[PDB]
Ligand binder design. Structure first.
Ligand SMILES: Nc1ncnc2c1ncn2[C@@H]1O[C@H](COP(=O)(O)OP(=O)(O)O)[C@@H](O)[C@H]1O
Ligand SMILES: Nc1ncnc2c1ncn2[C@@H]1O[C@H](COP(=O)(O)OP(=O)(O)O)[C@@H](O)[C@H]1O
Ligand SMILES: [Mg+2]
Ligand SMILES: [Mg+2]
Lengths: 440, 586, 433
């Protein structure tokens, strides 16, 4: 058990340890304080017989001469087992549910490893979010990276909860699992998530990593990578189709800027790290499917946009990543619409791999195209005569019945499509582009 | 032989002592894992190494071993139809050796098969005096391509013994008694990636390359040795244009370089190239391709080096007298890798955070292409044609990468997202795009077609320009405002756009249009333009012409679909056109 | 002179040499590498124990312990002689023509010296460039600094070759020479210039210094000083009227910013060094004439435009150091008119001292002014004024468009202008004609 009693210098969150041997870059450490308090840290630098570390909880109260540093001999790791489903952890993969101690099959590097370009497979089949405006129009496929954006307080937390409890896959024998990671969420909202997850029984399908707004920022960095490591284990080793949901990754970006500022790495994107884009890119790129392996990992990141005019590095991060998008809007949130999805700007690039026959149903693409076109022109009607009373009434009925379904009420794609037909009939029967005469 | 000791590890930068014998830019295997790194500094015996992989878990005391060379490429039999990364690591051999889907750290795999058996057929007589570049024999690496074993640079002398035989690329196939001594030759030579390969002489690229893409080859053509930037927004093309030129170009070899793109954008090419067997030779495209593959999450140094590794291979093949075409998709990702490593080195920014050397780096890359007289006694002629896709975020061509590229390339095919939504998918905006080769290739095509081709190209461009100007008076004051011949000018412009400019990549006949076919298809459109104006000069009206030319004009519509065996049909069109109008004019 | 195996340290393109003595600031360096390759360098800074140098060809492949450095005991020089005319060199004054290599009369510090302002002579004479609107409307003067601009791939580089071939002086009492400096242009552009000169025979009055886009940036910075040193030698020591043409000075500024970033110097506006203004000044201010000495150094630098966007430091600073401006534009070039010179934005601030009676001919000033304003109103009307707009149309196709391979006599430029104003009623001036 390696531990040194040689702290020479502490400056802010950083400590200088001396007469050291065998310490490695980014290895984990524990500062065992002179009072017996233990604090976690990481190795920033190792120089000959010296090591500079950064203390996660800060260096308050530390007496240098009567404390020691234990060198754990490994990087940041996740304990890994099939027992994780039905369990709740914190930002560091430590349990928070008071549940039975889990024996990891193995510990894996939280960064994971990078896919061989040869071995990567196309995203294909269909994940049923249980939400029409997603499942039907902006279809989520397994292996896709589909983020949801919005302004503060736009149902995105509730929407993420709904997708977490209602998402499943239809024809796969080997079952669906969902990994939920909350990033810097207030205790009230995390507790709300827990009561909802527990009442719905969705925890039994889930692995949850909860990080709170007052948690250490470095834990906010670790949480999404924690989630993706668990997802990659379940998907590529235990063969599951895994859905990863990440709340307020904007909170993640701010925490990453915070950690960078503590390390004094003079950064140049409005104080943000500068590699902010590359960090999110390496994080976002961790989705997809591997050749010859039945598993899949899917990401739904949730982010917050202050305004479209306001220039910020975080929205431009989103610009570098998107493979589609689902957009929530405040003016629309007020209207009482349950998922406030402005359907026009939201897009899914890979919708067509998930739609079809044997996947969703034959009517999927057809219904989607007609609904979108008619809704665009009919909303612009809400903005004579040929602006159809029928059209604008269809747009408002579409928003108040079809897109609004209840955060606790899931629409199967069959029922989504059947409702689509129900209200699609209230349209001029020969005003539709339909190369297959439908005859429902 | 000298073992260095790590004395410092801090993120990407490792400092190792006792490495006085290494050189700057030497590559090293760092730490116990042996992860690859590059010497950027040296202070006494202490070298500063910038490593290409993650340094997590590496610390003082561990060994560092220099590979005694800079980032280099292995060049010899076994290179064609292989898929490397930016540093020439065999991706399929990763699959096989490491038995995993992931690129582990510090694992070294030789690029070529040093165990494979190849039949060397010697072609030099014993006693022949040789200098660098001389072909001493060949191996039929594929059914298509003859891999010509050349004497390496820096070697001169007399062949003492050489005999045909079955060997490895490690076994000695030839013996050269140079002034210093006798040293055997192998089938493989290494070359530093960042240093261009020596040539006898650089030439002007004046011969046009046959893309089979009508837009390009007639209005914005690229010569064998020229350079073409493909700047456009997403979905406009520029991955299909890369593919299209790689398929149908009249070039021996193709080096496709994937510059740290998104994972799925690479998955596409990875699967789609093998089934792109063009029937000009009847063998697969991979049979003539070297593919460098890099994804968005792959090591930054690999993404940055990708294009240089690729152009080194392209140089190695044009040194045998071959024509080579190098494809970069996309150089914007390459520049983002460059910027990332410049920032992590804490360098001084230039524009948009890009390094100050961004421009000079781009010039260094593009000037390594071109038409060259290769080394060797016979003074062979080779060419490298560079086609580089750029993805300016938001389509802004004022951005540093595109502006610096446009500074040195001489061909610009600017993709326009508006034409793509219009499904004019050879989106190459005819007004904004250009080629500074157009006049020289015009003289070339005038002589070898023995027709007045360039007169036709200027006339077509003239009607397109006038189309642009007349569509504004259309938008503001209506189509009825226009002259009768003005409406004719627009309709012949619609002919040139829809019947000639638009060209489907996925139809067997439209995907490639030969020089002969290009000339005839343009000619019939232009003869239509000529005859109808005479009608108006006599007093016939535009509608009078259109009602009566419906059929002949549907024949020009299908001109692109007539196969390469039956171009007499297109030749028949223009004459049939002429006879048809004379009945309408009355 | 001795060889030093005293290489202590290499960081990027910078070396630290130790146990130096008698090393001077900006002195030159030769590194004999462990493999024998020779690379040249320049000292940036020199102390007692040590000196810092930057290697032009870079520091790649250098083994520190087994390489040697030699301090050449002089700065960047130019070996000058009259034998330079007809020859083409690189950015460093080394031959590229495979020609009879020169034995110089002497070596001159390419920094040169600054003219005593008392001894400076105000520019006051005519140079016939052979392009009508330059010689006529926007007239160039001996010793003047008048720059020209261009859009990427729009013929701004062809105008340079044309100007260089047709540039001459009428009096011909002393000979006229042109100095061409290529600064970071591609091999194709440099080849175009070299062959144009060789086929037109303009090399016979020319000295050419060619620097390429993939050449080292420090060499690119050196190039214009080499050229202007040769020009000042030909003009102020051999009495020639020299025309210095610099192809793409924007590339000069890019190379200067690149070396400034390489040395981690405090950035100026948008990365460009803080000394960029004065550094361009030491180039531009090398034009002119000297009291009591026949001979002129005349400069026309060519700059690629920032493409009608927000103000950029180099046009701004050039304008603060230069006086005039000329513009080339695709709007005339893709209209087929060559040279594509936009007459309205163009100007020669020193024109009035180059043209008059005894320099060109009587009917020059009135032609310049009257045709200029007539084209202005003609273009504004174009884009009964019976044919006043058609005056602009003809000015466009015959007066401006003379051809890249046509050397107009000055008098026939004047004659064509006069015959064009015949379209306009004679009711426009109080002059004799
Ligand atoms: N109606 C509202 N308008 C504006 N801001 C709100 C509103 N409701 C909540 N907020 C702010 O946003 C936070 C929660 O928003 P968010 O995290 O997006 O989840 P949700 O959208 O589900 O409320 C709250 O802590 C509150 O500060
Ligand atoms: N020359 C072409 N012919 C037919 N379709 C094309 C052509 N170029 C592009 N496309 C269409 O555009 C789609 C995507 O274009 P792509 O080359 O991937 O653009 P980007 O590289 O910008 O994403 C292709 O699937 C194809 O359908
Ligand atoms: Mg919330
Ligand atoms: Mg692409």
């Amino acid at each position: 058990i390696k531990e040194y009693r040689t702290i020479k210098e502490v400056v802010g969150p950083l400590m200088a340890v001396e007469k050291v041997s065998g310490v490695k870059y980014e290895e984990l450490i524990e500062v065992r304080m002179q009072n017996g308090e233990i604090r976690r840290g990481q190795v920033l630098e190792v120089q000959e017989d010296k090591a500079m570390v950064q203390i996660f909880e800060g260096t308050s109260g530390i007496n240098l001469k009567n404390s020691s540093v234990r060198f754990l001999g490994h990087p940041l790791q996740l304990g890994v087992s099939e027992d994780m489903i039905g369990r709740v952890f914190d930002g560091l993969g430590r349990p928070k549910d008071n549940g039975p101690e889990i024996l990891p099959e193995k510990y894996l590097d939280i960064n994971g490893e990078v896919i061989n370009p040869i071995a990567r497979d196309y995203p294909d089949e269909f994940i049923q979010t249980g939400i029409s405006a997603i499942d039907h129009l902006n279809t989520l496929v397994r292996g896709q990276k589909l983020p949801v954006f919005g302004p503060p307080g736009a149902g995105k937390s509730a929407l993420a909860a709904q997708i977490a409890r209602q998402a499943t896959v239809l024809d796969s024998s080997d079952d669906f699992a969902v990994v939920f990671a909350a990033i810097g969420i207030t205790f009230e909202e995390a507790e709300f998530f827990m009561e909802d997850f527990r009442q719905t029984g969705a925890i039994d399908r889930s692995v949850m990593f909860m990080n709170l707004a007052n948690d250490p920022a470095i834990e906010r960095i670790a949480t999404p990578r924690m989630a993706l490591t668990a997802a990659e284990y379940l998907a590529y080793e235990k063969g599951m189709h895994v859905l990863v949901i990440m709340e307020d990754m904007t909170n993640y970006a701010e925490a990453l800027r915070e950690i960078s500022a503590a390390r004094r790495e003079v950064p140049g994107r409005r104080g943000y790290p500068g590699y902010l884009y590359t960090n999110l890119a390496t994080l976002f790129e961790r989705a997809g499917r591997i050749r010859g392996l039945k598993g899949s990992v899917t990401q739904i990141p949730i982010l917050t946009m202050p305004e479209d005019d306001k220039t910020h590095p975080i929205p431009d991060l989103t610009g570098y990543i998107t493979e589609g998008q689902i957009i929530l809007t405040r003016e629309l949130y007020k209207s009482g619409i349950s998922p406030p999805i402005d359907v026009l700007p939201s897009l899914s690039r890979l919708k067509d791999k998930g739609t079809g026959a044997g996947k969703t149903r034959e009517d999927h693409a057809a219904t989607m195209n007609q609904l979108f076109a008619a809704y665009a022109q009919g909303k612009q009607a809400k903005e004579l005569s040929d602006i159809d009373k029928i059209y604008a009434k269809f747009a408002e009925r579409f928003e108040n019945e079809y897109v609004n379904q209840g955060f606790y009420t899931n629409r199967t794609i069959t029922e989504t499509l059947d409702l689509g037909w129900e209200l699609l009939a209230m349209l001029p029967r020969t005003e539709l582009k339909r190369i297959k005469d439908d005859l429902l | 032989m000298q073992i260095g000791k790590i004395i410092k590890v801090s993120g990407p930068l490792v400092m190792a002592e006792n490495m006085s014998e290494a050189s700057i830019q030497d590559m090293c295997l760092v730490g116990d894992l042996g992860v690859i790194g590059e010497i950027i500094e040296m202070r006494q015996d202490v070298a500063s190494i910038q490593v290409y992989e993650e340094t997590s878990g590496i610390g003082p005391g561990e060994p560092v071993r220099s590979t005694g060379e800079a980032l280099s490429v292995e060049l010899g039999p076994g290179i064609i139809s292989q898929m490397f990364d930016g540093i020439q690591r065999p991706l399929d051999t990763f699959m096989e050796v490491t038995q995993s889907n992931f690129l582990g750290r510090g694992v070294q795999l030789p690029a070529l098969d040093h165990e494979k058996q190849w039949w060397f057929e010697a072609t030099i007589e014993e006693g022949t005096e040789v200098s660098a570049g001389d072909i001493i024999g060949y191996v039929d690496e594929t059914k298509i391509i003859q891999h010509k074993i050349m004497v390496p640079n820096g070697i001169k002398g007399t062949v003492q013994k050489i005999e045909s035989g079955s060997f490895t690329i490690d076994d000695p196939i030839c013996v050269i008694e140079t002034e210093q001594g006798l040293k055997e030759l192998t089938m493989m030579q290494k070359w530093p990636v960042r240093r261009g390969r020596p040539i006898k002489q650089k030439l002007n690229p004046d011969v046009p390359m046959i893309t089979g893409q009508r837009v390009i080859d007639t209005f914005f053509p690229v010569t064998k040795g020229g350079a073409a930037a493909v700047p456009g927004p997403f979905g406009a093309g520029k991955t299909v244009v890369q593919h299209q030129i790689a398929k149908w170009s009249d070039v021996d070899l193709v080096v496709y370089v994937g510059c740290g793109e998104r994972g799925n954008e690479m998955t596409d090419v990875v699967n789609e190239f093998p089934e792109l067997i063009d029937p000009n030779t009847g063998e697969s495209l991979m049979e003539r391709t070297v593919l460098i593959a890099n994804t968005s999450n792959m090591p930054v140094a690999a993404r940055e080096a990708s294009i240089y590794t690729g152009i080194t291979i392209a140089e190695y093949f044009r040194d045998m007298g071959y024509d080579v075409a190098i494809m970069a998709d996309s150089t914007s990702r390459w520049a983002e890798a460059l910027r990332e490593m410049s920032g992590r080195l804490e360098e001084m920014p230039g524009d948009e955070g890009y390094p100050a050397y961004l421009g000079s780096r781009l010039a260094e890359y593009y000037e390594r292409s071109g038409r060259v007289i290769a080394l060797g006694s016979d003074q062979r002629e080779g060419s490298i044609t560079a086609i580089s896709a750029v993805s300016p975020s938001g389509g802004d061509i004022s951005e540093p990468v595109t502006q610096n590229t446009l500074r040195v390339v001489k061909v610009f095919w600017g993709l326009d997202s508006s034409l793509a939504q219009k499904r004019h998918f050879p989106s190459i905006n005819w007004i904004q795009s250009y080629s500074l080769y157009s006049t020289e290739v015009g003289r070339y095509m005038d002589q070898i077609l023995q027709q007045d081709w360039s007169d036709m190209v200027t006339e077509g461009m003239r009607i397109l320009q006038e189309e642009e100007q007349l569509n504004e008076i259309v938008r503001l004051v209506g189509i009825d405002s226009l002259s009768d011949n003005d409406r004719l000018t627009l309709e012949v412009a619609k002919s040139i756009r829809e019947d000639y400019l638009q060209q489907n990549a996925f139809d067997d006949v439209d995907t490639f249009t030969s020089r002969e076919k290009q000339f005839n298809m343009l000619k019939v459109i232009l003869t239509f333009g000529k005859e109808a104006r005479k009608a108006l000069s006599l007093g016939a009206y535009f509608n009078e012409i259109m009602e009566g030319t419906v059929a002949v004009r549907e024949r020009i519509s299908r001109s692109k679909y007539i196969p390469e065996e039956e171009l007499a049909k297109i030749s028949s069109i223009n004459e049939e056109i002429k006879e048809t109008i004379q009945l309408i004019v009355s």
